Symmetry: D2
Subunit: 380 residues, 4 copies
């Protein structure tokens, strides 16, 4: 049907036998069998009706073939990279969530995997990074937290041309804004803690594969490694997913309003927003994004203290995470990207004074009034 | 106090501010902060009051220093082995759960990790397997499904003598029967889907470390990889853990009764039970095990069909998993150990006719009557 | 705060001690006490942090003083009417949900309570029904299922003039559309199974009182009778409430589109919609309702079979309940109002061919296309 | 089967279609229908697979025909008494839980219902209370908190002889100790917050009827009044019920040990325990009770302060409720029976210095050591 209708009714969204208008929460760890092998489900880790349904939904939403729900976005990333073996080289984006940076440096390189960081907006930089042992290209768009917009279909074509895998981290856009499998990508993955759960009460990850033979691989790993999303929280994700469209419009609209508002502040010295029209990413954003996202990062004038600004907001809420109905705000150097050494941070674009604002769903008037409370506290 | 009292009151078992006689279920993904860094909790993946409490409990029960709860026992094993890097060699037990076999062969060896299988009851075999790149010894006791009893304190001393790590998979015994950290081991890990949840409605894993510096390492990995146990199911584990003592006595007692009963059957050609007194493992079992477990594996006479036997039980329940209040039964070649190639299975002790019976909690009379229903369905 | 911001942040919407961006689920039945009496909470039935927060929220949303959450809307109605004693007379609306009819006839009249049904759009009819033993006026607007719009502030003034209580059942409008406490009413009550939970996975009721001395009375009854809303489902209500504004706009807009669409069908012989402009209720609706609701009832031409029409819809879903993201549809004579005798039904406006359509949130195009599938099946 | 096996496998304890070893949690509020009326379930309040299964279990356990799960024990009592109408007279026990006293005085007498309190151990007192408008006999055994043991089969025969209903509140014994439907009673009801949930994290009530025509009546009221037990907490009850036998033995045994221990204290001036052999209730207790319960009430010497005693226990926990794995303790005049006026309390047996101890499951040694801490603080 149309996309709004797929949220309500797509995936598996009911119970065949009873008519229940809500996938039951199958807490059972195991399932009895009449004949061996013939049983439809066998063990809750290998798969169960509750997580099966959330998996179904994220996949129809992403225009892919198979969904896979994981305990966290980190856990999803980890078993996706478990496709690769020692010797393999991966090209990564120069700006990714600090944890993806951490999992690579602190774990994956232990496993014989090598990495090269690349501004994947420069395709020649990407093309130049491809070695005979290179096996994949991993990137986010928009990036955490600078919101660099990368050309998905471009990177996908590069990947196919060289028998590489394309892995896009679609957390910030969500399928309402971007469906990377529709631009040639092989694997799409989400931190469903953000916009797909949307209510600030679920940690989880999602992977959606387009080919069926890579669904086999990601599934075999999901079950062999077991970092699965549990029944209650699979059920909550799917519950929060049903409002994704309604929530995401409210986010996008509010963020338009916050950007025009921050641009009109001289206290604000730089702004990161894919809808900034002097931003060179502006056109690739329009082309591949239905909306410009609801994340804005910005810098204050160098003498101005961002912690003062942030600790004096009162409707906006100082915390990590993003994609929540509540507008969260954060200083990535002191929080989500402290896992990256300060020298690499400043080298890749993340000054110590950067502020990252997950625009939320509250009434726009109350948000601007609140941001004013924070500008007022640093004398502006 | 005493162990039964630690189940009810140990770990964190209440709520400091309210008095609540039950750790609240902290579904929040993130936590607001008044001043950056100084917040007690930050992000539900990194840790939250609900999972923190289950973590506390499994650790006081295991006589260790730190607990870590994971999405599944598999997920716990995976991030424990993420301590190791390419080049490292691990000695493993010749009989481990087929999934541990699978994670090793299908994933871990991709990461440059090498393995040697060893009957860790033969300490000279173990001693002989130790190479200059060997870094750890991983084993279960009792083993899945043959219930080989290994000398924990012996393997621990071997490990310390060679600057190795000892990793014991304590799923079948549980802390009520065995506390391997008390015999010199560094890491203890559980499939909490079995006896610790005990109710057949939770998938989860637990790791407990004894040193504090290895708790730091396992924690850093728990958070960086993210295969964490979610709040609802952390809460259910801890709920099921409170009855572990009551349930485990009932299991052990029933299993004593099932063994004497199966031994008196000529249809039963071989039996695997750590309390079998002609079993050479019998004495190391008495020495290090408070009870003999509630798992029995057995073989029928070669012309007798184990699937007929199993598909004709009606109180006992044909399914995977174990440690449940309900007595589960299973054929490991056709089920939990199908992940091991048939030739390696027969080579390591697992005939195609082996039956594995998780003795449960139902009334012993009803169980023997039921097992009779299955013997009746095969004689000739 | 503006209303959209109160959904996200109003009531109690976080956890004071931790910062948790989600009221924890306090499953504890009881709370320890250091000193007797001086404990803040005491017993989960009497009140707990989880249900306390949902109670807080429905009350700030309704512009009242106290919230009270119940196990179901029926259970809320029952303990509200438990204010009254034998001898008391209540005026009720001629069109109320069949269960309110049932609770009155089958239970409340057993208790010595007397009732008079009255079209509360005719204020003289209401005024004329007031006897010396009359103690309250109970009504819904819009009514289930004919959507008769009653003048709330008019009925409120009548009530105060005669030392009566005004009880309005605000289920169909919800606080986004109507806030009856702002028009002079004493008690507002909800079937939170409808729009406040909004996700078709919560049964519950809410009562909000404006005076503080009637909050005392409703509270004393909530605890003495105990028909309370449990912690998990209190938590889900409040979770579903956060999107009420986003969801309710989508509902209202879709319903505008469905009405214009049904009006342009000659197969449709009569329509019940508070926004029908030839409907005499149209102006009192504009005056007291922010939107016209998202319920439409309609009749087909007398030879046309409504069960054929309904059993041939495929995006719309044949079931009881309403207020769900999914568009539910139903035949009140054969379903929600079978509890009213057929003769009283036809007498009060409910023909056997009436159809009631809870307009939902799915894309409007897919809904009209679907309703066409049902018109096509009866030949029009 | 045997009773221990019915806890694990009785009622509905699995899922027919999947084999799930755990009744799924059917959060759906409503159920789709293919043809009207034909649907097995239709609205979660009227009944759903999750609560249906808990209802099934409490009924097979109680040797009755129909189970009914309610939001709280209070809510169960309230809709059971909703069978009666104005004019009806009920005989009640002189010692019932203070809330049952409150619901009667503060609500039920409003409805034209009249009550007579009677020591139902004296059958002539009961016989003498029966008026032409008397319709039922309501009592608890053991009573809250004095644990008066009443002759169930005697009261049942009295009831049938006079076309009365017998309603026994079986909360303190639980079906493991007493099954009143087996002694001639019509209605059995439980506060499942106590021993049936057993884990101190569920509020709920249960009613079990023996005749099928009274199951119809209690059901019609359950649905019309709606004070139902919600899906998550229905699921938790049934989860806690599976260990009832294991937990209840531990309770009973510990309580034997606590009584002998308290009897040997001269600081303890009076003791209430159905197993006290100088207690005249001792023999009717042996005859109708499998065990003597795990509640002990006792008085200290008149100069000794019970709040000092209680506020100085540290394994035992000062709170309301009972039946929990943790040993709770309480002063009924200052807590659970403050709802009864002090003069009626002292008149019926409840001095201001009475202590009520819900013996729990913790190790007996740790409990006696703890009670010593409280005797030490007042000096024995
Ligand atoms: C694009 C992307 N992909 C993947 C992920 C990971 O997904 P999750 O495992 O959290 O669900 C994220 C996470 N994002 C959160 C993480 C908070 S920091 C974690 C903790 N403080 C720590 O120090 O480790 C954020 O930027 O605010 C992500 O933005
Ligand atoms: C000693 C030990 N350590 C660890 C684990 C893993 O713990 P979990 O991740 O399951 O919680 C187990 C598991 N045991 C279950 C697994 C069922 S098979 C899985 C599935 N059919 C598949 O084909 O993969 C069993 O033997 O019955 C284990 O016995
Ligand atoms: C304005 C109003 N107030 C109160 C309520 C009651 O609230 P709840 O207890 O359901 O949450 C409702 C209910 N409405 C549902 C009830 C379904 S019928 C019940 C069952 N089939 C039965 O035969 O009894 C409906 O019309 O579709 C209500 O519309
Ligand atoms: C034999 C019996 N039947 C029924 C019930 C009622 O069952 P529930 O509704 O609690 O589940 C009970 C309750 N018993 C608890 C109630 C705590 S007091 C309530 C509150 N403090 C208030 O002041 O009101 C107790 O004695 O400790 C009961 O002992």
């Amino acid at each position: 049907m149309k996309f709004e209708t797929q949220l309500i009714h797509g995936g598996i969204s009911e119970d065949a036998t009873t008519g229940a208008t809500s996938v039951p929460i199958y807490m059972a760890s195991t399932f009895r069998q009449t004949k061996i092998g013939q049983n439809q489900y066998e063990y809750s880790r290998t798969g169960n009706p509750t997580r099966a349904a959330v998996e179904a939904l994220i996949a129809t939403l992403e225009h892919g073939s198979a969904g896979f729900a994981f305990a966290s976005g980190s856990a999803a990333i980890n078993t996706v990279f478990s496709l690769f073996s020692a010797g393999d080289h991966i090209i990564v984006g120069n700006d990714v969530y600090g944890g993806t940076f951490r999992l690579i440096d602190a774990v994956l390189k232990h496993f014989g995997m090598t990495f090269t960081a690349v501004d994947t907006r420069d395709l020649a930089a990407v093309e130049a990074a491809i070695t005979p042992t290179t096996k994949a290209i991993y990137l986010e768009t928009p990036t955490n937290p600078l919101l660099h917009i990368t050309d998905i279909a471009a990177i996908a074509k590069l990947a196919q041309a060289h028998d590489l895998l394309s892995i896009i981290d679609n957390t910030f856009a969500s399928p309402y804004v971007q469906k990377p499998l529709d631009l040639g990508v092989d694997i799409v993955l989400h931190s469903a803690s953000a916009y797909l759960g949307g209510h600030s009460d679920v940690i989880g990850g999602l992977v959606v594969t387009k080919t069926p033979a890579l669904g086999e691989k990601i599934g075999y790993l999901q079950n062999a490694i077991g970092s699965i999303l549990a029944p209650q929280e699979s059920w909550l994700l799917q519950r929060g997913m049903k409002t994704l469209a309604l929530r995401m419009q409210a986010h996008l609209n509010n963020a338009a309003k916050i950007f025009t508002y921050l641009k009109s502040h001289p206290a604000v010295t730089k702004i990161y927003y894919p809808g900034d029209p002097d931003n060179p990413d502006f056109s690739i954003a329009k082309q591949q994004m239905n909306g410009f996202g609801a994340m804005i990062s910005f810098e204050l004038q160098p003498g101005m203290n961002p912690q003062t600004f942030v600790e004096h907001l009162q409707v906006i809420t100082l915390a990590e995470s993003l994609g929540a109905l509540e507008s969260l705000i954060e200083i990535p150097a002191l929080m989500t990207h402290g896992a990256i050494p300060r020298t690499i941070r400043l080298q890749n674009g993340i000054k110590d004074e950067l502020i990252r604002l997950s625009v939320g769903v509250e009434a726009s008037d109350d948000l601007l009034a609140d941001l004013e409370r924070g500008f007022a506290s640093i004398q502006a």
